Structure formats: structure tokens, C-alpha cells
């Protein structure tokens, strides 16, 4: 009699059952289809492939990402993910499970409804709900107020929240996040001499990045110290016993989030885009925000990012102000945890949207229940 929590990432689907401390399954938000007919012959009647199964079978397929920058765009492929999730990952029957979904901030009225529809009419769930990807992250930390920095693989959002609601007027977006960073990491490594071309080396620069990257406190210091003495080097071993060595590339890659000018973005540095937001707010509350800055998303995992956010949001804000950056160790599966939590609540049951409620009011119901 338990519920389902599915967290859509434009890079990873993170799903599990409500009440548990971590998604049971996590996989690639992709959809691979044969590049031509000759690939369908032996298919054995199946249409597409999904997640990891769509990885290893790359050459024969054409991969597509149903989520772009956080917003779902290739629907019929989002329907194929959701399916695979329910049946193949969780091994459960949608039809008999309440389901908490996540919408990115500024989720379009239509996208919210379209999604609703599909869940009840295509998957016939017993009841389901939709939560803003950000708010959950905050909830997951036990806060009903704060300004969350959701940074995943596709998008970077700055979110202010008072007494539950987000303030869509103060939402700050940044089309710079993971993919981008991984990718720069390459540019800067290639410039270094290495050669990351194949799709395989790409997944190598991500692993590399993932494990030897951080965020310098005083950049030009670590920068100057990085090229004067080899003290800050590290080395990485590829699959065939071959070793590479990452120099200042270590902090030059994540430096982008604070300096979009690197990859060529007239957009403001996250530190700023964060200040810029706490400022778009009612004077008497920011106070609480400035102090409750909470981070989530795979790309805010870079070590020393909190110790760097301090450094910055601090220097931009008032001399008397009190700032406190909340960076949870499992800040990656933050979003998902929230939904879990949310769904396992008593005061929450009365809030779901039930199959029977959806039938007299239609899907335009999303706007009256999910606040």
C-alpha cells in the first residue's frame, strides 16, 4: 500500500518508494531508437531502449533527451521513460501506487497538466502529485524557508521560498550546469594536450571531473600557486593503464559557475545570481534567507563551493548581515528525498490528487491542488 517518488532530471531519473532514505534506481534520462530499419530486424519486436540499456547499445541507436534544461520537451519519450521506470526499475504497477512527481521551477501550466493527464489516463495511477523540484530539496533539510540553489546536469536555478511557496518573481535561472562543466573540462584538457573525442572519453572527463575537482577560495591565489609549484597536481588512470594528470584544470572547470564568462555567457556568476535573488525580495525577510542558503544538485557537489559561496554572497551583502550556506553531504539526492519525505507525511495524504477527483474537474485540477 506504499507510494512512488520519481525525480525527473534532464540527465538522471531518480526513483524509489516513499518512506525510504534513497532512490532504489537511478539511470540516464535518455531514449535510444534505431538509426534506421536494418537495426530493427533482430529487435525481436521491441521499439526503443532506455537508460543504461540505451547506453551500451549506442551505435545502433539514436539517443534523445526528453528533458531540456529541466522542462520536459519530447513528451512521447517522457512517456517511455516513465513506463520503463515504473515497470522496469521499481517493478511496480503504476495503476496501484500513489505517485509524487517533480516539476522544475517555472513549470509551464500546460506541462504541468500534460504530465498530470498522462499519469492518470495513460498510466491510470490511483492518485498522484506534483512538487517543485526545488522546494523538496529545502524540505529534505527540514526547512520551510530558505533560498535553494538547484544545480543538476542541465539547469541552474536560484530559488527563494517563504512559508512553503516559492517566489516565481525572484527565480533566477542559468543555462550553465554539469554537462557544460564536464564539457569545458574537456576544452581545457584538450588545450592541455590530451585528446578527448570519442563518446567514451567524454564519460571519462566526467568521472575525472567528478573525482578530482573542487572550488578554490582565492582563485588567482590557487591559480598562481598551481603554476608556480606542482604541489596541487593529481594524476588519473584511464581504463587501459594509461595515466593523465590534471593541473589547475582541477578548479578551472568548476570556476565557471562563478565566472560564466569562461564558456562565454554574459550571464551573472552564481554567487551573484544568488545575491541578485535575495534582493528581489521583501525587505523584512531576506534576513532569514541570507542565512538559510541551501544547496542541492549533482553539480553543487564540488568541494569548497560552500566555503566559496560564503566568501562571495558575504562580500556582496550588508556589513552586519549573517549568512549561512547549508550544504548537505547527500545534497545530490536532495530533491528526491524531499518528495519521499513529503509523501510519507500524514498531513500530506489529504493533499494528493485522486483518480476520482481527476474525473469531475479534468486535468486543469493541477493548479488548485498542488498550490
Amino acid at each position: 500500500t506504499t507510494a512512488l517518488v520519481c525525480d525527473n532530471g534532464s540527465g538522471l531519473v531518480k526513483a524509489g518508494f516513499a518512506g525510504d532514505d534513497a532512490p532504489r534506481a537511478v539511470f540516464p534520462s535518455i531514449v535510444g531508437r534505431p538509426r534506421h530499419q536494418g537495426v530493427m530486424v533482430g529487435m525481436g519486436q521491441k521499439d526503443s531502449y532506455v537508460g543504461d540499456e540505451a547506453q551500451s547499445k549506442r551505435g545502433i541507436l539514436t539517443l534523445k533527451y526528453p528533458i531540456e534544461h529541466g522542462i520536459i520537451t519530447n513528451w512521447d519519450d517522457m512517456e517511455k521513460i516513465w513506463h520503463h521506470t515504473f515497470y522496469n526499475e521499481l517493478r511496480v504497477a503504476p495503476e496501484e501506487h500513489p505517485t509524487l512527481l517533480t516539476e522544475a521551477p517555472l513549470n509551464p501550466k500546460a506541462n504541468r497538466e500534460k504530465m498530470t493527464q498522462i499519469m492518470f489516463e495513460t498510466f491510470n495511477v490511483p492518485a498522484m502529485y506534483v512538487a517543485i523540484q526545488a522546494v523538496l530539496s529545502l524540505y529534505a533539510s527540514g526547512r520551510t524557508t530558505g533560498i535553494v540553489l538547484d544545480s543538476g546536469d542541465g539547469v541552474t536555478h536560484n530559488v527563494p521560498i517563504y512559508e512553503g511557496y516559492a517566489l516565481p518573481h525572484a527565480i533566477m535561472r542559468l543555462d550553465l550546469a554539469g554537462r557544460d562543466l564536464t564539457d569545458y573540462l574537456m576544452k581545457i584538457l584538450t588545450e592541455r594536450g590530451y585528446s578527448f573525442v570519442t563518446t567514451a572519453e567524454r564519460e571519462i572527463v566526467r568521472d575525472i571531473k567528478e573525482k578530482l575537482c573542487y572550488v578554490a577560495l582565492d582563485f588567482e591565489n590557487e591559480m598562481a600557486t598551481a603554476a608556480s609549484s606542482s604541489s596541487l597536481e593529481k594524476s588519473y588512470e584511464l581504463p587501459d593503464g594509461q595515466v593523465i594528470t590534471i593541473g589547475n584544470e582541477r578548479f578551472r572547470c568548476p570556476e565557471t559557475l562563478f565566472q560564466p564568462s569562461f564558456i562565454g555567457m554574459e550571464s551573472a556568476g552564481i554567487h551573484e545570481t544568488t545575491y541578485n535573488s535575495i534582493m528581489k525580495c521583501d525587505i523584512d525577510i531576506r534576513k532569514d534567507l541570507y542565512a538559510n542558503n541551501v544547496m542541492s544538485g549533482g553539480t553543487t557537489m564540488y568541494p569548497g563551493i560552500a566555503d566559496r559561496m560564503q566568501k562571495e554572497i558575504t562580500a556582496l551583502a550588508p556589513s552586519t548581515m549573517k549568512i549561512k550556506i547549508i550544504a548537505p553531504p547527500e545534497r545530490k539526492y536532495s530533491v528526491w528525498i524531499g518528495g519521499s519525505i513529503l509523501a510519507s507525511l500524514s498531513t500530506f495524504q489529504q493533499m494528493w490528487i485522486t483518480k476520482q477527483e481527476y474525473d469531475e474537474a479534468g486535468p486543469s485540477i493541477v493548479h488548485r491542488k498542488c498550490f
Binding site: 532514505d21 534513497a22 520551510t144 512553503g164 519525505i341 507525511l345
Partner: peptide
């Protein structure tokens, strides 16, 4: 009665481990 929903999110819950 949503206020008690935060009264809770604040107080907390106890998620079952796994693996």
C-alpha cells in the same frame, strides 16, 4: 490545515535505510 504540514516538515520523519 497546511500549516501542520510544515509544522511536520520542520519536526522531521524517520526514513528506512536500505541495501
Amino acid at each position: 490545515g497546511r500549516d501542520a504540514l510544515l509544522d511536520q516538515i520542520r519536526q522531521g520523519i524517520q526514513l528506512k535505510s536500505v541495501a
